[PDB]
Amino acid sequence: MNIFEMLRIDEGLRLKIYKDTEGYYTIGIGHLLTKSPSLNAAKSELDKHPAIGRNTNGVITKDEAEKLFNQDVDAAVRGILRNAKLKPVYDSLDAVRRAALINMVFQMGETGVAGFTNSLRMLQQKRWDEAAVNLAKSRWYNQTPNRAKRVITTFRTGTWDAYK
16 A cells, blocks of 8 residues: 555546535546536536646546546645645654645645644654544544544554555
8 A cells, every 4th residue: 555545545536527525526536627616617627637638528538547646646745845834744754654644635735734733743743643633623524534534543553454
């Protein structure tokens, strides 16, 4: 396991336009196409992404999916490295826990995760179970419980147990 395999589990692989946890048009492996309510709007965006740049009509191959996936993951890592509150945290975690942090940014963006103040602090001080206890009481946790549980278990143990 690693970040890719982990996110593929959390996000699933959908070759056709779908709606996310929030009601937004996404495709593949969690690739948000557009916050607009229009499926046409969505198809448009899709047809225009450089990795695709063709006429899909809401349908992509398994390759294009992974290609967007790769980019999205990199984008996540960038957001982290470019965020002042996040970077310090990342630098301080091990290879497995780093995957947990990337998962949160991938899911919710750099800005959202940056606002997990108390939890980031506990993570920086290596207080696993407290970090865990603390994350479990967020709205993120109530919103996507299944996912959140595995991520938290990841921070807590520093093992892939929750995904195995």
